[PDB]
Every structure is written in C-alpha cells, then in structure tokens.
Amino acid sequence: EFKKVAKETAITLQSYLTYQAVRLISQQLSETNPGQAIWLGEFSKRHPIQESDLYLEAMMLENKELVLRILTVRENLAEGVLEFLPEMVLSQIKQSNGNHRRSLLERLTQ
Amino acid sequence: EFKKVAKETAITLQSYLTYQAVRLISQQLSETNPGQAIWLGEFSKRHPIQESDLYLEAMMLENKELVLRILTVRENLAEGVLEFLPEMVLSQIKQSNGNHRRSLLERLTQ
C-alpha cells in the first residue's frame, strides 16, 4: 500500500503547503494591509482550508488577487522546501525512533 | 521564513507518516488480531495521534509491542514514500495552479 499512502501523503502535503502559503500571506497582510488580513481570517472560518482546491475555488468568487498570490506563494514554498523534506523527515524519524527504542529498552531492562 | 516552514512541515510529515503507520497496522489487525485493532481504536480516542511522540510515550505504558511495530512500520513507510514526495507534490501543485489559473483567466476574460 505504498502507493495508496504516497498518494494520500502528497495530497496532504499539497494542502498543508497551501495552508502555510495562507499563513505567510496573512502575516504580511497584518502589517501591509490589515483589512485584508481580517477578511482572509473570516473567509477561512467560512471555508475549510483543509479542502484546498474548494477553498481557492470559493475565494475566486470574492478575491481573485488573493487567490493568485496563494498560488504563487505556495508554488515557491513547495519549490523551496520540498528538497530538504526527505532528508529531514527521515532523519527526525530515525532519531524519534532512536529515543523511543532507547526509552523502552530501558524499561524492559528495568 | 523557509526555515520556520520547512521545520513545521517536517514535523507535520513525521506525525502524519506515524498516523499512516497506525492506520496500516490497524488494518492488518482487523483480520490478523481483531481484539488489538479495537484496543488500538479506543487508545486513539483517548490519545491524539496528532501529538505523536506523546501518543507513543503513552502507549509504552500499555503495549510496548505495538509501539515497536509503529516505529518500524513508520520508518519503512518514510523510507519507501519520501523519495517520490518532492516530484509528486510539486507536480500536483503545478497542475492545481494550472487549473486555477486557467479557470480564473476564463472568468477575467468572461
């Protein structure tokens, strides 16, 4: 099932990177254009960024400009971040595993 | 902020791959050992797999064997899946972006 799981993870990463896009943009808009930060916040109450293609589709009806920036920002975030994710996540898995195996072997040898 | 975002994404991927581990294991246990599938389900009600190092720490107090299998299965899942994630997620971002840009350019040129 490494196909079913790869696919589901990629969809999850795609949507998560989109949330990170909207988090970053909203942070800039806090200083740069506060009334749009606020708007972005309320629209996100009314639309679960979880279902991200629908969110963006919902947003084009009201703010095409913000939709475009999320598209752009998330493409850059992906392009920036994705290359280190393999090495990072695997390394964190090997060391979380390491900790947990060191801890329970400690309990097993009381 | 590509560091703050890479770090947060890796933590999220780590935890998500752990949930996928527990999803897969629970699926096997459905057929292989049903009474442990059920137990795994109830423990997951009482412990948010979201905070995954704590979950696994909570589980060692009650089922060290299952904790070890999650450790193993999630390391394999990571090792299996992580190499295609860059190419996959970026490709899905380029084509989701493509769709949304094709759709709103359609509205802008009514």
Buried/exposed A57-96: b ≥16 CB within 10 Å, e otherwise: bbbbeebeebbbbbbebbbebbeebbebbbebbbebbeeb
Rounded distance between C-alpha atoms, residue A23 and residue A29, angstroms: 10
Q: Rounded distance, CA B31 to CA B26, Å?
A: 9
Domains in chain B and their CATH numbers? 1-110 (1.10.1200.210)
Q: Give the chain B residue nearest A94 (alpha carbons).
A: B75
Count Cβ atoms within 10 A of the Cβ of residue B37 and give its class: 0-12 exposed, 13-18 middle, 19 or more buried. middle
Answer yes or no: do B75 and A97 touch at CB < 8 A: yes
Nearest to B4, CA basis, from A31, A77, A70 = A77
Going by the DSSP 8-state scheme, the letter that residue B51 receives in this structure is S
Per the CB < 8 Å rule, is B64 touching A108? yes
What is the C-alpha separation between B34 and A54, in angstroms, rounded? 37
Size of interface A-B (CB pairs under 8 A): 149
Residues recorded for chain B: 110
Q: To the nearest whole angstrom, how far is the Cα of B56 from the nearest Cα of chain A?
A: 8
Substitution target from B9, B73, B107 for chain A, most A beta carbons within 10 A: B9
Rounded alpha-carbon distances, angstroms, from residue B70 to A93, A97, A100, B62, B65: 11, 9, 11, 14, 9
Rounded distance between C-alpha atoms, residue A47 and residue A17, angstroms: 17
Alpha-carbon torsion A65, A71, A75, A77, what sign? positive
Q: State the sign of the Cα–Cα–Cα–Cα dihedral B4, B5, B7, B8.
A: positive
What is the distance between the alpha carbons of residues A100 and B64, in angstroms, rounded to a whole number?
A: 10
Show the CA angle centred on residue B106, arms to residues B104 and B109, nearest 5°: 110
Find the DSSP H helices in chain A: 2-32, 34-46, 52-60, 64-81, 85-108
Asked if A100 lies within 8 A of B67 by C-beta distance, the reply is yes
Is A11 in Cβ contact with B5 (below 8 Å)? no
> In the structure encoding, which two tokens stand for residue A23, read together?
């988090």
- The first and second tokens of residue A86, run together, are 């393999």
| Resolution of the coordinates, Å | 2.5
**A56 and A73 Cβ atoms separated by less than 8 Å:** no
Minimal Cβ distance to B75: which of A12, A52, A93 = A93
Q: CA-based Rg of chain A, rounded to a whole angstrom?
A: 19
